[model samples]
Target: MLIVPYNLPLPGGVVPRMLITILGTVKPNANRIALDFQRGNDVAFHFNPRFNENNRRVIVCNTKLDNNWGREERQSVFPFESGKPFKIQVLVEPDHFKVAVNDAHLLQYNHRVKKLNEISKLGISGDIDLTSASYTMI
Candidate 1:
């Protein structure tokens, strides 16, 4: 298994038509996990899957600018299960990010931090076993 709380640099930065892929398995007792595209200390995108939020599952998406978080976009349709493997794909469009789970479209988050090219880091953290994380042109 890959190391937890993994961080990687995006060689050419984020751009339209690029794809980010992650393979991981949720921990048996996982409560939450987070994937982030970062621009230095600011988060360009925050994609979090919570398994136990008020006894319900939800995906939370948001952006952090100047160390302050913007409005949260919550999706009620959960595509993950504890102790199961998952493939997450995020397609970078000019205006938004199209996220898919296990090869099926799941949700989209509109760009809030619009300078995509400044987003140079990928970070994964919390309760999961990350297998791999990579990015490429689509």
Candidate 2:
């Protein structure tokens, strides 16, 4: 099992038709969790799930460039529960990243930084126990 707040290098970087998989369980009192695709210090895609946000659950997606975060994209359809195991899949497409959670389509974030091959790291952090995280070309 991998530890939380883990940052791992993406060997060969990212390419079209690649699939990134994450398996983890949410902490019972979890407030937020984030998965980031990074190119150097910039985040190409920021996938975050927040619970207990003003009494609502939401998922926030964004990108960070030059130390500044871009517009936030919030989705209200939450498929995660406290103290539950979850499976997240990210499919790299030509123009966007498609996300699926628990075998269901969740959302898609368009390429904000471009140059997919430059995203050389994957980061995971916040209130969860990570089982595994890996990528495979498909």
Candidate 3:
């Protein structure tokens, strides 16, 4: 991960078996954060972590295909703490993405849009403070 502005984009798109690393911290008043792997208007994967939403702690993983959002996969693993730092690694396999946070496995998201190379852009938003981010093709 290296220092850059938000919304890191891959050079010439990412091929299969690549890796993306993100190192950042959560703000104390942070409400949420989302990482999106997108192709034009279609979102292949959305990794969202919520720190405060009606006092519920959860993480949501989902996909958006052609403006249609799929059912959210909400899980209980809250690896994020407000005001603390985190390291996120996303492995781009052929069929699925392996996501790990803070040196631990987080979740696995199957490819909804199978064209991996079309998923070319990365967007991050919300109250989190990003220290560094990188996109690498293996």
What are the per-residue Cα lDDT tens digits for candidate 3 across 40-90? 898888999988778987999999988999989888999999899898999
Error of 1 at 54 (Å): 0.7
Count clashes in each candidate, considering only residues at least 3 apart in sequence or on different chains. Answer: 0, 0, 0
lDDT of 2 by residue, 11-124 (tens): 767888999999999999999999999999999999999998899999999999999999999999999998999999999998899999999999999898877889999999
What pairs collide in candidate 1? none
Q: Rank the candidates by TM-score, best first.
A: 1, 2, 3
The segments of candidate 1 whose C-alpha lies over 4 angstroms from its true place after superposition are none
Candidate lDDT scores, in order, read 0.92, 0.92, 0.83
Error of 1 at 100 (Å): 0.1
Indicate the TM-score of model 1. 0.97
- How would you encode candidate 1's per-residue C-alpha lDDT over 20-132 as one tens digit per residue? 99999999989999999999899999999999999999999999989899999999989999999999999999899999999999999998887788899989998999999
Clashing pairs in 2: none
What are the runs in model 3 whose C-alpha is more than 4 Å off?
1-5
After TM-score superposition, the amount by which residue 98's alpha carbon in candidate 3 deviates from its true location, in angstroms, is: 0.4
TM values, all candidates: 0.97, 0.97, 0.90
Q: Give Cα distance to truth, residue 136, candidate 1, Å.
A: 1.7
